[PDB]
Design a protein around this ligand. Structure first.
Ligand code: ZN
Ligand code: ZN
Lengths: 165, 166
């Protein structure tokens, strides 16, 4: 019930790697950002990436880290950014994590548009995002290759007047 | 009507720069790829880019350069690419021939699975021309491009390999 975001650091790398146990789960979580297996050299490159904020999700009651989230593609010209790398490591927590990052994107960074992508079979996550204000814009058909098949990605967004009004 | 694509080269740079006469037209044509004014250094970086093909469109009968088109974001992992930097100087028919030529490269030469194309929502004639040759609207990316004090909406469109061979 009480979560906060903190900066994701080297000491949090191993926990994240242990949560990402398959190539398909890696892709569901992060798309084209990484190769399987996830490892510390890739995570170092991730946190050092320009225009990317990496966060661990902390349960304030226990101090345990229970997930991960990122605000990336921070674009100061178009005033936009993309939420991604959404992970609820321990068994809505997702809603609280999204609200915390939306506060950063809209209220601290003063952005105009925040995007998100979710693969179409993750209907529970899509419903949760729609409940807090994300809107489906379009389904990017067979846009991610996974082995010999292709996944469809729902491109979703929220504009500043949907958050602030 | 006999059109061909040729590699866009240094000798074609000045003509393209003179055609892109305003920041708004630069954005309509190329989105976030460049800064205004368009210049030689930026075009050189463009043609030397990894995973990018730059073409001038030539009328075979006269040798006149009548447009520009690019196949970029060539992604060998997801087997996809994006058509962009579409410039047509007859326009509807030339645009259709230019798209077919680049789709031949993407699907028949490069063996890709998916080709995307973005067009700002006020270019209703171009969107209708793209739909006529098989492109499908996927979604409208709301207020995704800042232009001065306002935002433009982009129609994200696509064609899959089995739509090309239909
Ligand atoms: Zn704050
Ligand atoms: Zn050929």
């Amino acid at each position: 019930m009480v979560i906060k975001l903190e900066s994701f650091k080297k000491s949090d790398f191993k926990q994240l790697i242990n949560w990402i146990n398959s190539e398909e789960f890696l892709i569901q979580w992060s798309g084209n950002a990484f190769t399987f297996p996830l490892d510390e050299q890739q995570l170092e490159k991730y946190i050092e990436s320009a225009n990317t904020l990496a966060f661990k999700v902390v349960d304030e009651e226990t101090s345990d880290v229970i997930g991960h989230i990122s605000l990336g593609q921070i674009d100061n010209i178009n005033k936009s950014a993309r939420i991604g790398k959404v992970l609820v490591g321990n068994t809505s927590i997702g809603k609280h994590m999204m609200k915390a990052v939306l506060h950063i994107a809209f209220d601290e960074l003063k952005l105009h548009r925040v995007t998100l992508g979710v693969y179409d079979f993750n209907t529970s996550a899509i419903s949760a995002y729609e409940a807090i204000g994300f809107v489906k814009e379009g389904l990017l058909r067979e846009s991610k290759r996974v082995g010999e098949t292709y996944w469809n990605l729902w491109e979703m967004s929220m504009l500043e007047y949907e958050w602030k009004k």
